[PDB]
């Protein structure tokens, strides 16, 4: 089997930058090399076929190059909608084989999150569990510290975070932090607070509610 190596699997680039994604085959593949784009939602598109030909409807800032074992996908000037994982595929021999992929991280200017906190509903509480959600909306870069404080006591070990993929329009992230407590623990405390530290914020932002 021909192995397709994409050594760089995570690549950052600024909007407007020239971006190069490389692929090497274990042996010569005679230009029988296609490029695919997979968006964060799992949809796949053909970009380039036979090393260099644009697929119908693909913008012209995309080009393909190389021969023998070494191939490149170049994006002449990065657009926000280019956030994706890029894959090579040889069709010189069966079985068809794919590189490991290269994921783009788009670098844009700093944007601080806006922050929201949500108390648990009675509909949830009545079943024995409180989920408290803190939302960080439309920020860059990815790095953010989210600290939960209950009656001003710093919490540890009782929250989980999730982050969206970079937005295809504004290249930002959004993040949820969820604090899980038993109903009985939820009801022993008054003030639920999430404190957010980020490069876009000149000092930490705190959002809170009072139960009862």
């Amino acid at each position: 089997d021909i192995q397709m190596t994409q050594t760089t699997s995570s690549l950052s680039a600024s909007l407007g930058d020239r971006v190069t994604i490389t692929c090497s085959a274990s042996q010569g593949i005679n230009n029988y090399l296609n490029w695919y784009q997979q968006k964060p939602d799992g949809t796949v598109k053909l970009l380039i076929y036979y090393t260099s030909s644009l697929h119908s409807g693909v913008p012209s800032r995309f080009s393909g190059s190389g021969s023998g074992t070494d191939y490149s996908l170049t994006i002449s000037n990065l657009e926000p909608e280019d956030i994706a994982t890029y894959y090579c595929q040889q069709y010189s021999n069966l079985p068809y084989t794919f590189g490991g992929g290269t994921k783009l991280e788009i670098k844009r200017t700093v944007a601080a999150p806006s922050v929201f906190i949500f108390p648990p509903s009675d509909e949830q509480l009545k079943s024995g569990t409180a989920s408290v959600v803190c939302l960080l909306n439309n920020f860059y870069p990815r790095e953010a510290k989210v600290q939960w404080k209950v009656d001003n006591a710093l919490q540890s070990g009782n929250s989980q975070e999730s982050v969206t993929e970079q937005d295809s329009k504004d290249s930002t992230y959004s993040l949820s932090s969820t604090l899980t407590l038993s109903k009985a623990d939820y009801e022993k405390h008054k003030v639920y607070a999430c404190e957010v530290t980020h490069q876009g914020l000149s000092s930490p932002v705190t959002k809170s509610f009072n139960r009862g």
Partner: protein, 216 residues
């Protein structure tokens, strides 16, 4: 317009087998080879095999000769792929693709089909409102304690799209999934519309609308 409509997510038992369909349309089904591709979570694409629909002739990646069977039905214009003796290594997204002759490439791809292989039982999500106890207002729904992936979430049956973030699921220490879907609205545009999240968990046949009450 060429379209490849794959069948829905599927939970299936270790040792069981599962059939996936790829309903095609916008092109003569018989005039194009169909290939299948696997993608394990956080991983790259693996070619499984291709089928000539016109005469049913098949080509398999040797790694899948014991796993996969590709067949067609020329009448419904539908390709099928059956995976047998499933283990948790079969847990993946499966794609169907069309081959174009130009110089060969996979020019159209299905949306993919998530197969989970597990002993654990299906479980529908509970859906709870996220409402505040400023320039913009936020609300959402918490989609809690479901198995397996995936859920889909929409707002006002697809009419509300911008400001929407549906977070990826986290595996909880219970082995159940949970996620939140939020929307932000500029304060001024808040009190026009109502806000209802529509949550679909196909593996459990759960469909749940939750109206998130704006406070009075």
């Amino acid at each position: 317009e060429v379209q490849l409509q794959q069948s829905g997510p599927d939970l299936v038992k270790p040792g069981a087998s599962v059939k996936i369909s790829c309903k095609t349309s916008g092109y003569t089904f018989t005039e194009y080879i169909m290939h299948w591709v696997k993608q394990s979570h956080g991983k790259s694409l693996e070619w499984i095999g291709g089928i000539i629909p016109n005469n049913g002739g098949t080509s398999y990646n040797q790694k899948f000769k014991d796993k996969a069977t590709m067949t067609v039905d020329k009448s419904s214009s539908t390709g099928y792929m059956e995976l047998r003796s499933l283990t948790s290594e079969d847990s993946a997204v499966y794609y169907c693709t069309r081959r174009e002759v130009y110089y060969y490439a996979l020019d159209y791809w299905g949306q993919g089909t998530l197969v989970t292989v597990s002993s654990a039982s299906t479980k529908g999500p509970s859906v709870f409102p996220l409402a505040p106890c400023e320039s913009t207002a936020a609300l959402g729904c918490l989609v809690k304690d479901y198995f397996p992936e995936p859920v889909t979430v929409s707002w006002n049956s697809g009419a509300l799209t911008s400001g929407v973030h549906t977070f990826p699921a986290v595996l909880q220490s219970s082995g159940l999934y949970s996620l939140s879907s939020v929307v932000t609205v500029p304060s001024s545009n808040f009190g026009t519309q109502t806000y209802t999240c529509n949550v679909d968990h196909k593996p459990s046949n759960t469909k749940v609308d939750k109206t998130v009450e704006r406070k009075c």
